[PDB]
Amino acid sequence: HMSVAHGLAWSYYIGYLRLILPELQARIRTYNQHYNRGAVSQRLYILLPLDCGVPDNLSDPNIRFLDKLPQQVYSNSIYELLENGQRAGTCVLEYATPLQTLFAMSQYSQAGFSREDRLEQAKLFCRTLEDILADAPESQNNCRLIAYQEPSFSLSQEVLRHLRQE
Amino acid sequence: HMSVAHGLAWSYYIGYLRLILPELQARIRTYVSQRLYILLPLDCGVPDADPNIRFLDKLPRVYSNSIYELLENGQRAGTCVLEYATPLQTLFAMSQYSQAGFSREDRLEQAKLFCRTLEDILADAPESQNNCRLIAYQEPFSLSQEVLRHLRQE
Ligand SMILES: CCn1nc(C)cc1C(=O)Nc1nc2cc(C(N)=O)cc(OC)c2n1CCCNC(=O)OCc1ccccc1
């Protein structure tokens, strides 16, 4: 209840996920009802790279930006997940911002924080966030956490493994 | 670093202050003191505050900040871009949510740890010392006087 990763998971929920998820299904449903290659899935897919290697802003060639999810100010992007050149799925995808902070804390002396500490805190953040989202009222059936560690790796396949299984 | 406060201080810098401060002086110069004044109430009571702090205009990632006129005796004594440190709202919410297991004593201790951690980060950050001032305080009071004590001394 006092760790670095506990503070970050509660902040990401309090200051962002609790304010965006109550209206996320309505925005996806509106875009699906109004427009149409494939229906956009009803959940927010949050990428959780355990190595905390999050691009500055956001990101594989098989993950093509399709459009922005409009409001009923949050810019949420819809991506087309490709396989063999053709679209295999489509969803609102984004990186878990607090993993950038865990990476920065490991790079700056002022924090200390080793590479082993960062990897342990990243899994702890993922666990704490999972536990928050399981019991949170504003996050019932519209959020899926995608945690993974790169060792042949495809980010599009990791998201497709979760989209097909739902 | 070690605790909840350290993660919040580094997040506040990484995800917001490092992206907004490089261009803050240019926005103020285009449009008021040249620094961002961040209110840090140690009780984490972040609402909005005082009749002597009147909203003047908006300063035309980081998306817009408010300029306020600090009054004293009915007349304007200063003007600056002022805002609350959002992570203190999170410390307050963590104390109000059971699944966080964070007491009122924990919240006050983490609030001070956050102020000191963010002051150290900002002293050595290339995002610059000249564009940001932290205003930490605990109510036993005028919020306009606390800001004026820092504006006049700079
Ligand atoms: C605080 C929650 N948190 N704790 C940890 C740890 C990580 C996060 C996090 O990822 N937060 C987050 N992510 C976002 C993503 C989006 C999007 N476009 O998808 C929008 C958002 O909200 C506009 C997002 N937030 C909210 C805060 C960031 N914005 C900000 O500081 O804005 C300055 C500002 C100041 C005055 C006026 C207007 C803006």
Numbering used by the authors:
A (entry chain A): 152 to 187, 191 to 213, 216 to 228, 239 to 317, 322 to 336
B (entry chain B): 152 to 182, 194 to 210, 215 to 226, 238 to 317, 323 to 336
The paper states:
STING is broadly implicated in various diseases, including cancer, autoimmune disorders, neurodegeneration, and rare monogenic diseases. In this work, we use an orthosteric STING activator and inhibitor from the same chemical series to discover that STING M271 is a critical residue for molecular activation. The M271CH3 NMR chemical shifts reveal a unique molecular signature for pharmacological or genetically driven activation and inhibition that is not able to be resolved by other biophysical methods. We show hydrophobic interaction in this region plays an important role in regulating STING activity.
THIQi (inhibitor) and ABZI (agonist)-bound STING155-341 led to the highest quality spectra and therefore were used for 1H-15N HSQC and 1H-13C HSQC resonance assignments (see “Methods” section for detailed description of backbone and sidechain assignments). Approximately 88% of the backbone amides and 85% of the methyls were assigned for THIQi-bound STING155-341, while 84% of the backbone amides and 60% of the methyls were assigned for ABZI-bound STING155-341. Since M271CH3 and A277CH3 are >10 Å from the binding pocket, it is likely that the large chemical shift movements are caused by agonist binding-induced allosteric conformational changes rather than direct interaction. By mapping the chemical shift differences between STING-bound ABZI and THIQi onto crystal structures, we found that the hydrophobic region harboring V155, M271 and A277 beneath the CDN binding site is significantly perturbed, indicative of distinct conformations between agonist and antagonist-bound STING155-341. Chemical shift differences are mapped onto (c) STING155-341-THIQi and (d) STING155-341-ABZI structures.
